[PDB]
Every structure is written in structure tokens, then in C-alpha cells.
Amino acid sequence: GVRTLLSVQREKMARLRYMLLGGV
Amino acid sequence: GPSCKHCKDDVNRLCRVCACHLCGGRQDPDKQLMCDECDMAFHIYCLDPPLSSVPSEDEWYCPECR
Ligand SMILES: [Zn+2]
Ligand SMILES: [Zn+2]
Ligand SMILES: [Zn+2]
Ligand SMILES: [Zn+2]
């Protein structure tokens, strides 16, 4: 699928969310 | 650290590196296509001609890489 800036931003937010928590 | 040296991740500055490579605006990130070659962002309405919608394919390439 064509990726949007939004989709990329959401994936970075998700990745960050896991480390914000502590990785689990 | 920042993710973009050019705008230091200042969301109140235009940036043609991490936002629309054509106009620099961060508005409508849902309408900014990512070139599957150079990974720049492009407002569908900044392309010449403008795309009335987000393409239905699996990959897209900007006017600079085609
Ligand atoms: Zn930037
Ligand atoms: Zn634009
Ligand atoms: Zn490109
Ligand atoms: Zn360019």
C-alpha cells in the first residue's frame, strides 16, 4: 500500500509508546 | 538529538525534508504520500497534476524519482 506521512508518524508513535512503557 | 536536523523538529516551521517536499507544510499528513524510492512526503494536492485521492496501488513514486 501507498504509505502516507500519517501512517509513518503513527508507527513511530507506536514504537515510542513501547519504550515509554519500558519495552513490554 | 532531533529526527530532522533541517527543522530541529520545530513543528511551527515549514520543512520540506520531513513534511511535504514541495511546499513544506505538515497539514493533512493523511494526504502526504511517501515516495517508495526517496521517502519524501508529497501533498496529493501539491503534485502537478493534483491527485484527487490517495492512490489504490501498493507503491508510489514521486515526480523526482520517476
Ligand atoms: Zn524537518
Ligand atoms: Zn505540500
Ligand atoms: Zn522520490
Ligand atoms: Zn527534490
Residue numbers in the entry:
A (entry chain B): 84 to 107
B (entry chain A): 299 to 364
Copy text from the publication.
DNMT1, a maintenance DNA methyltransferase, and ubiquitin-like PHD and RING finger domain-containing protein 1 (UHRF1), also known as Np95/ICBP90, a ubiquitin E3-ligase and recruiter of DNMT1, play pivotal roles in maintaining DNA methylation. A maternal factor, developmental pluripotency-associated 3 (DPPA3), also known as Stella/PGC7, has been identified in mice as a strict inhibitor of chromatin binding of UHRF1 and regulation of its cytosolic localization, in cooperation with exportin-124–26. Here, we report the structural basis for human DPPA3 binding to the UHRF1 PHD finger. The binding affinity of human DPPA3 for the UHRF1 PHD finger was weaker than that of mouse DPPA3.
In this study, we determined the crystal structure of the human UHRF1 PHD finger complexed with the C-terminal hDPPA3 fragment. The conserved VRT motif at residues 85–87 of hDPPA381-118 is accommodated on the acidic surface of hPHD, the binding site for 1ART3 of histone H3, and 1VRT3 of PAF15, in a manner concordant with the motif in mDPPA3 (88VRT90). The side chain of Val85 in hDPPA381-118 forms a hydrophobic interaction with Leu331, Val352, Pro353, and Trp358 in hPHD. The positively charged guanidino group at Arg86 of hDPPA381-118 forms hydrogen bonds with the side chains of Asp334 and Asp337 of hPHD. The side chain methyl and hydroxyl groups of Thr87 in hDPPA381-118 forms hydrophobic interactions with Leu331 and Val352 of hPHD and hydrogen bonds with the main chain amide of Ser90 of hDPPA3. Leu88 of hDPPA381-118 is surrounded by the side chains of Ala317, Gln330, Met332, and Ala339 in hPHD, in which the side chain of Met332 functions as a separation between the side chains of Arg86 and Leu88 of hDPPA381-118. Residues 88–101 of hDPPA3 forms a four-turn single α-helix, which is not kinked and markedly differs from mDPPA3 complexed with mPHD. The contact area between the hPHD and hDPPA3 (ca. 449 Å2) was smaller than that of the mouse protein (ca. 1360 Å2), which is concordant with the weaker dissociation constant of the human proteins. Intriguingly, the α-helix of hDPPA381-118 has no contact with the hPHD moiety in the crystal. The overall shape of the bead model was well superimposed on the crystal structure of the hPHD:hDPPA381-118 complex in the asymmetric unit. These data indicated that hDPPA3 binds to hPHD at 1:1 stoichiometry with the induction of a four-turn single α-helix.
